[PDB]
Design a protein around this ligand. Structure first.
Ligand SMILES: *[C@@H]1O[C@H](CO)[C@@H](O[C@@H]2O[C@H](CO)[C@@H](O)[C@H](O)[C@H]2NC(C)=O)[C@H](O)[C@H]1NC(C)=O
Ligand SMILES: *[C@@H]1O[C@H](CO)[C@@H](O)[C@H](O)[C@H]1NC(C)=O
Ligand SMILES: *[C@@H]1O[C@H](CO)[C@@H](O)[C@H](O)[C@H]1NC(C)=O
Ligand SMILES: *[C@@H]1O[C@H](CO)[C@@H](O)[C@H](O)[C@H]1NC(C)=O
Ligand SMILES: *[C@@H]1O[C@H](CO)[C@@H](O)[C@H](O)[C@H]1NC(C)=O
Ligand SMILES: *[C@@H]1O[C@H](CO)[C@@H](O)[C@H](O)[C@H]1NC(C)=O
Ligand SMILES: *[C@@H]1O[C@H](CO)[C@@H](O)[C@H](O)[C@H]1NC(C)=O
Ligand SMILES: *[C@@H]1O[C@H](CO)[C@@H](O)[C@H](O)[C@H]1NC(C)=O
Lengths: 224, 366, 346, 50, 198
C-alpha cells in the first residue's frame, strides 16, 4: 500500500492520571509522542505487519467511518498469545487466544486457550480519531479522543488531550500489530511513543491546554 | 511555654487554637456481594508455575479474616500493606495468582529478585503492592511414585517481564545447528517435572502459593471491606472516610468540573483538595476548619496577673475552641481608648498596649 | 565589552581649566530597609493535626523552639530597622500654608490632603510601581474558607502553617515621618537635626549650601531664577523618568520576590517522599501497622525538619544583609537629609 | 548511576536551591568587582610628557 | 605524571567559573583612575575633568589640611624627594617581605580547602557497607542497595548543604569588604578625606 510522511505537529498528548488539577504546571515522565516528529501516512487502497515499538499513536481523519479494529501479538501464527480488539456497531470483543482467525479479506457486509472475554461499549464513535496504545507491567492501556477538523489538509495545529478508556491487565509481549479494513480509501497515521519528560499546563477548568517537550530544543529545556 | 515561673513585660506567642471535630463520616460504595476467596484458597488441583491461573475479584465485599480458616499457612507476608489493616481501607481490583513450586523457590516470589522461577516462570514487578501466601502441600501434591503434572520452564531466550505468561513449548536451541522439532544434540525441552516425593527433605517439599495483587485507588472502587456507611453532613469540621481516605476538615459543595474518569482533586502540597462521593456522584470541597495563632499580652508578674489575648489573623466572630478589632487579628481583654501615648507593648499595625491607671487595667491605643 | 569612551585631558604645567556655568542635578538612590516578617509553627507543617506524628515529633527535642526564636528575632529586627531609619525626628513639623520658597517648587514631594493616605505624588508612583505579593498581613481566612475560582498560593501557605505578620508602623506613619523630615529640611535647614528648629529663608539657606561647597554666595543671588528653574526641570525629569521607566525599583521587587519564593518552595517541599512510601501522612497511618508507619513517619519528619532549618538559615542570612542595608540607609538619612556632606560620591 | 538518580528524585528541590544560592554568590562577586573598580565613566590616559 | 587535585575536583562535578572582568580590564580601570587623579585632581570625580598643574594641585591639598600653600612652593624639591624615597621604600618592601598580602592569600586558601574537603568527603561510608555505589549495586539486591544508597545520599547531601551555607557566610563577609573598598575608592582617590585614620 502507498506510504507517505508528515509532521506530528505538537499532537498526541494524554492525561497521565485520573486526578483533577487546575491552574498548575505539572511535570510528568511517561511514554509520550515527541513533538515535531514524523508519523507515517498509510494509504490503504491495496500488507505486511507494523511493529509495535513501545507504544503506538493512531490517527484517522475519515468521515465515512471505515477503519475498525486491531490485532496485537508477536508472531501471529498460533505459537503465541495474541490480543484481538474487534469493534462493531454494538460492542467490542477483546480476547487473547492463539488466534488463527481472519477478517481482513472480502468476507464482510456485502476458543483454543482463552483467558478473558471483556465486552463493553464501542470504542470508535471532518473528524480526527486519535488513539494511544501502550503495554506497561503487563497492563494494556488505551487512550482516545475525537476532535473535529475544519480544513482537511494534515494533522492540525493546537492541543487536544486524550482521555483514558480501559486498563486491561492482559496482553503479553506485543511486538507487531495489524489494522483491518472495510469495503462495501482508508488513510491512517502511525506514530511511535518514546520515554520523554513533559511539562503539562492546566487551566482554571482543569483541562490540559499547553505542553512543553523538555528534550526538543534548548529553549524548551530552559522552560522545563 | 517559657519554662519559667515569672514572665516579663511583652507579647509572647504561646500556642494555636484548633477547632476539634464533632462527628465522623464513613462513605463506602453500596456493594452487597461476597468475594469468593473460598474458590481460590480451597481448590482440588492447582496449576503449574509456567501456566499459573489469574482470577479477577471485583464487585464484592472482601473479608480477609476467613483466609486463615481456609488454608493452614504461617505468614501472611505482605509488601505494600499490612495484613491487619486490610479490612479498613480498600482498592479497585484484586487479582489472585495460584501455582505450585518447590520449597527452595518460595523465597524467589518477591519484588526485585532473580533465579529460575523469578526469571522464566513468574516475575513480580518492583512496585508490587500485595501479599504472598504460601503453605506446605505434602498431603495433596505428593505421591510415592513421583509427580509429573507440575511443570516448570528453565530454558528461555530472554528474561520475563513482570506479570507475563508463557504457554508455547518449542524445542530450545543453544547452538548454531537448528533443532527443527528434533530433541537431539544441543536440543532441550524447556519443561521438566518437579518429581515430588514424600521422602524428600523439608526444602524440597511442594508448596502451594497464592499471590494476591492489589492495585491502588485510581478508578472507582469495586471491592471494599466490611465497614458500615454513615450519612453525609456538610459545613462542619468532621472526620471523613472516603474509600479509605481518612482526614479531618469541612465538606462543602463545589463548582469544580470533574471529568467523568476523575475521582480526586490534588493540591500543590500533594494533599486532597476535592473528593467525589461514592454513593451519590457529587463533588465535595475539602477545607480544614478554623485555626490561627494565639498571642498573650502581659505586663510582668511583679506588676499584675492580668493578661490580654490576641487571636492572630482572624475576623473574630468564630472565637472559641472588651473586644477590639485590629489589623493583626483582634484583641480580647484590653479596652481601646482614644488617646495616643508612646508604644509600650507592640501588637500590630499601629496598635500598642500598656498598663495604665485611668483601678489598674490593660488598655490599647494608637 | 567596552569599558568606556577614550579620553585624553590636555595636561600642561601652566594651563588650567575653570568652569563658567553650572547645572543642578537631582538623582535618585533606592535602599531597602525591612523585609517580610514570617511565622512558622512545626505542627501544622510537619504533621498536620496527626497525633502520632506529634508524639513522634516530641522526641526530637527543642529544634522547633529555636527555629521559632530565630524567626521571632528576625521579625523584631525588621521593625527595629524601620524605626531606626525613619523615626529620626522628635517632632512632627508641618509646612506653613504659604508655599513660596524662593521660586523652588516642592509640590510633587510635599503631601496633599485630597487622598486619605497623605502621600505625595512621587510616593504614589513609588507605591504603585512596586507590586506586592499580597501576603498574610491582610486577614484572608474568610476568603480562604470560601473556595472561589482556583486555589491561591497564599491560602496554600496559610493552610500549611505559614503566616505573614504585619509591620508595626503603617504606611501612613512612614509618610508622616517623611513629611516631618521634609518640612524640617525646607523650613529650618540643618538646625532641626542638632537641636531646636530655627527658621531661615530658603534662598539664604541655599546660599549657606553654596558656601559649603566652596562657591561665593553672590553666585546664587545673581542667578536665583536660573537655579530655581533648573531644580524644577530636574524634578519634572525625575517625575517623567518614574512615570516611564519601570526597571529602577528592582531592589525592592527582589526583596518581595525572594520572600514569596522561599515560602512557595517550602509549600512545594511537602510533596516529597524523602525515601518513604508516600508523602501523604494519612495513607501511611492507614496502610500500615504501628512500627512500619512509625518508620515512614520518622523519615518524613526528618526530611521536613531539614527543609525547615534550611529555610530558617536562609532567612537569617537575608535578614543580616537587610540589616546592613538599613544601617546604610539610616546613615544616609542622618548625613544627607539632616546636614551637608563633604564625602565624595556619598 | 541511574538508580541513585531515581532515589535522589524523591528528595525534592534541595539541589535547585543549592544551585540558586551558588548562582547568586557568583553574580554577587562580579557585582562587587564592578562596584569597586568601574567608578569612572571615561578612560583618561597619560600625556607623553612625564 | 600524577593526577592533579583540580582534575579530581572537576571529575566529581565541581566547576570554577571565570570572572566577567579580565585582569587587563582591571588594569585599564586602574590606569584611567590614576591618570584622572594625576592630571585633574578631584575634579574628574564630580563632573568633567579639568586640568591643573600638579604643583598647584599639591598646594590645594596642603591648603586642605590647614597648611598655607607657600610651604609647598618654598619646599617643592624636598617634598618631591620624600615622595620618591617613600615609593622606593614601598618597592623595596614589596620585593623583600611577602607577609603583607596575607588576606588575599587567605581568600585563595579557604576556597581551595573547601573544595578539597568536599572531594575528600566522598570517601565516607555514613554507616553503609561501602562508599562506592557500584560495589553496593553489584553486591546486594534491590532493597538493600536502595537502603545503602539512601544512606550515602543523605550524607553527601548534608555535606553539600554545609558547603553552601559556609560559602554564603563567606560571601557576605567578602561583600562587606568590597563595600568598604568601594567607599575608600570614592573618598580617598576621587577626593580628599577629613576623617581621622581613614
Ligand atoms: C548657563 O546655562 C544656562 C542653561 O543651563 C543658560 O541659560 C540658557 O540661555 C539661553 C541663551 O539665552 C536661553 O536661550 C535659554 O532659555 C536659557 N535656559 C534657561 C534659562 O533655562 C545660561 O545662559 C548659561 N550662562 C552662560 C553665562 O553661558
Ligand atoms: C521522517 O522520515 C522520512 C523517511 O525518510 C524522512 O524523509 C523525513 O524527512 C523524516 N522527517 C523528519 C526528519 O522530520
Ligand atoms: C471554563 O469554562 C467556562 C464555562 O463555559 C468558560 O466560560 C470559560 O471560558 C472556561 N475557561 C477557560 C476555557 O479558560
Ligand atoms: C447505590 O446508591 C446510588 C444512589 O443512592 C444508586 O443510584 C445505586 O443504584 C445504588 N447501588 C446499589 C447496588 O444499590
Ligand atoms: C473445600 O471444598 C470442598 C468441597 O466443597 C469441601 O468438602 C472442603 O471441606 C473444603 N475445605 C475447607 C477447608 O473448607
Ligand atoms: C471582617 O472584618 C471586617 C473589618 O472589621 C468587618 O467589616 C467584617 O464585617 C468582618 N466580616 C465578618 C464579620 O464576616
Ligand atoms: C613645562 O612644559 C613645557 C612644555 O609642555 C616644557 O618645555 C618645559 O620643560 C616644562 N617645564 C619644566 C620645568 O620641565
Ligand atoms: C509649580 O508651582 C506652582 C505654584 O506657583 C504650581 O501651580 C505648579 O503646579 C507647580 N508645578 C508643578 C509641575 O507642579
Amino acid at each position: 500500500r502507498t506510504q507517505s510522511y508528515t509532521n506530528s505537529f505538537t499532537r498526541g498528548v494524554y492525561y497521565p492520571d485520573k486526578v483533577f488539577r487546575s491552574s498548575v504546571l505539572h511535570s510528568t515522565q511517561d511514554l509520550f509522542l515527541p513533538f515535531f516528529s514524523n508519523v507515517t501516512w498509510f494509504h490503504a487502497i491495496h500488507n505486511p505487519a507494523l511493529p509495535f515499538n513501545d507504544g503506538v499513536y493512531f490517527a484517522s481523519t475519515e468521515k465515512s467511518n471505515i477503519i475498525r479494529g486491531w490485532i496485537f501479538g508477536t508472531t501471529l501464527d498460533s505459537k503465541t498469545q495474541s490480543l484481538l480488539i474487534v469493534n462493531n456497531a454494538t460492542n467490542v470483543v477483546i480476547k487473547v487466544c492463539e488466534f488463527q482467525f481472519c477478517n481482513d479479506p472480502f468476507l464482510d457486509v456485502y476458543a483454543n486457550n482463552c483467558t478473558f472475554e471483556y465486552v463493553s461499549q464501542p470504542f470508535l464513535m471532518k473528524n480526527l480519531r486519535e488513539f494511544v496504545f501502550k503495554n506497561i507491567d503487563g497492563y494494556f492501556k488505551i487512550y482516545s479522543k475525537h476532535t473535529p477538523i475544519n480544513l482537511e489538509r494534515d494533522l492540525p495545529q493546537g492541543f487536544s488531550a486524550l482521555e483514558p478508556l480501559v486498563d486491561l491487565p492482559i496482553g503479553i509481549n506485543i511486538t507487531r500489530f495489524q489494522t483491518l479494513l472495510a469495503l462495501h480509501a482508508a488513510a491512517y497515521y502511525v506514530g511511535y511513543l518514546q520515554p520523554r519528560t513533559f511539562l503539562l499546563k492546566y487551566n482554571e477548568n482543569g483541562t490540559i491546554t499547553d505542553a512543553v517537550d523538555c528534550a526538543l530544543d534548548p529553549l524548551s529545556e530552559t522552560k522545563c | 511555654t517559657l519554662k519559667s515561673f515569672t514572665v516579663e513585660k511583652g507579647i509572647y506567642q504561646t500556642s494555636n487554637f484548633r477547632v476539634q471535630p464533632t462527628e465522623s463520616i464513613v462513605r463506602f460504595p453500596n456493594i452487597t456481594n461476597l468475594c469468593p476467596f473460598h474458590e481460590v484458597f480451597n481448590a482440588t488441583t492447582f496449576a503449574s508455575v509456567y501456566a499459573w491461573n489469574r482470577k479477577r475479584i471485583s464487585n464484592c465485599v472482601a473479608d480477609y479474616s476467613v483466609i486463615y480458616n481456609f488454608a493452614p499457612f504461617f505468614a501472611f507476608k505482605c509488601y505494600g500493606v499490612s495484613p491487619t489493616k486490610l479490612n479498613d481501607l480498600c482498592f479497585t481490583n484484586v487479582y489472585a495468582d495460584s501455582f505450585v513450586i518447590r520449597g527452595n523457590e518460595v523465597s524467589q516470589i518477591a519484588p526485585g529478585q532473580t533465579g529460575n522461577i523469578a526469571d522464566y516462570n513468574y516475575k513480580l514487578p518492583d512496585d508490587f503492592t500485595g501479599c504472598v501466601i504460601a503453605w506446605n502441600s505434602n498431603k495433596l501434591d505428593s505421591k510415592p511414585s513421583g509427580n509429573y503434572n507440575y511443570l516448570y520452564r528453565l530454558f528461555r531466550k530472554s528474561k520475563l517481564k513482570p506479570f507475563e505468561r508463557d504457554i508455547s513449548t518449542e524445542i530450545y536451541q543453544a547452538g548454531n545447528k537448528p533443532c527443527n522439532g528434533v530433541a537431539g544434540p544441543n536440543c532441550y525441552s524447556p519443561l521438566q517435572s518437579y518429581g515430588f516425593r514424600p521422602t524428600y527433605g523439608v526444602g524440597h517439599q511442594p508448596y502451594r502459593v497464592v499471590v494476591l495483587s492489589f492495585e491502588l485507588l485510581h478508578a472507582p472502587a469495586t471491592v471494599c471491606g466490611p465497614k458500615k456507611s454513615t450519612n453525609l453532613v456538610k459545613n462542619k469540621c468532621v472526620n471523613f472516610n472516603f474509600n479509605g481516605l481518612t482526614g479531618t476538615g469541612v465538606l462543602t459543595e463545589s463548582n469544580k468540573k470533574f471529568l467523568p474518569f476523575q475521582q480526586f482533586g490534588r493540591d500543590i502540597a500533594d494533599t486532597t483538595d476535592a473528593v467525589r462521593d461514592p454513593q451519590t456522584l457529587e463533588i465535595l470541597d475539602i477545607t480544614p476548619c478554623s485555626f490561627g495563632g494565639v498571642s498573650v499580652i502581659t505586663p510582668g508578674t511583679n506588676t499584675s496577673n492580668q493578661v490580654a489575648v490576641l487571636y492572630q489573623g482572624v475576623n473574630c466572630t468564630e472565637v472559641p475552641v472588651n473586644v477590639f478589632q485590629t489589623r493583626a487579628g483582634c484583641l480580647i481583654g484590653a479596652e481601646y481608648v482614644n488617646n495616643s501615648y508612646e508604644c509600650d507593648i507592640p501588637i500590630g499595625a499601629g496598635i500598642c498596649a500598656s498598663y495604665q491607671t485611668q483601678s489598674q487595667s490593660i488598655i490599647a491605643y494608637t | 565589552m567596552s569599558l568606556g569612551a577614550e579620553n585624553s585631558v590636555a595636561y600642561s604645567n601652566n594651563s588650567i581649566a575653570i568652569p563658567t556655568n553650572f547645572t543642578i542635578s537631582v538623582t535618585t538612590e533606592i535602599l531597602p530597609v525591612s523585609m517580610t516578617k514570617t511565622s512558622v509553627d512545626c505542627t501544622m507543617y510537619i504533621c498536620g493535626d496527626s497525633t502520632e506524628c506529634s508524639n513522634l515529633l516530641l522526641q526530637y527535642g527543642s529544634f522547633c523552639t529555636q527555629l521559632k526564636r530565630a524567626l521571632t528575632g528576625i521579625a523584631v529586627e525588621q521593625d527595629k530597622n524601620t524605626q531606626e531609619v525613619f523615626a529620626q525626628v522628635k517632632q512632627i513639623y508641618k509646612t506653613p500654608p504659604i508655599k513660596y520658597f524662593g521660586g523652588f517648587n516642592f509640590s510633587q514631594i510635599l503631601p496633599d490632603p485630597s487622598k486619605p493616605s497623605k502621600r505625595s505624588f512621587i510616593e504614589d508612583l513609588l507605591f504603585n510601581k512596586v507590586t506586592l505579593a499580597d501576603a498574610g498581613f491582610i486577614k484572608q481566612y474568610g476568603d480562604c474558607l470560601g473556595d472561589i475560582a482556583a486555589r491561591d498560593l497564599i491560602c496554600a501557605q496559610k493552610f500549611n502553617g505559614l503566616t505573614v505578620l504585619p509591620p508595626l508602623l503603617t504606611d501612613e506613619m512612614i509618610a508622616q515621618y517623611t513629611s516631618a523630615l521634609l518640612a524640617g529640611t525646607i523650613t529650618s535647614g540643618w538646625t532641626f537635626g542638632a537641636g531646636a528648629a530655627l527658621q531661615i529663608p530658603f534662598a539664604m539657606q541655599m546660599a549657606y549650601r553654596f558656601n559649603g561647597i566652596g562657591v561665593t554666595q553672590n553666585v546664587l543671588y545673581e542667578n536665583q531664577k536660573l537655579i530655581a528653574n533648573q531644580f524644577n526641570s530636574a524634578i519634572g525629569k525625575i517625575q517623567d523618568s518614574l512615570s516611564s521607566t519601570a526597571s529602577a525599583l528592582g531592589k525592592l521587587q527582589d526583596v518581595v520576590n525572594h520572600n514569596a519564593q522561599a515560602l512557595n518552595t517550602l509549600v512545594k517541599q511537602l510533596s516529597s517522599k524523602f525515601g518513604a512510601i508516600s508523602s501523604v501522612l494519612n495513607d501511611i497511618l492507614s496502610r500500615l501497622d504501628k512500627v512500619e508507619a512509625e518508620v515512614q513517619i520518622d523519615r518524613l519528619i526528618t526530611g521536613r525538619l531539614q527543609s525547615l532549618q534550611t529555610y530558617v538559615t536562609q532567612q537569617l542570612i537575608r535578614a543580616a544583609e537587610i540589616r546592613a542595608s538599613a544601617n546604610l540607609a539610616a546613615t544616609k538619612m542622618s548625613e544627607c537629609v539632616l546636614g551637608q556632606s563633604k564625602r565624595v560620591d556619598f
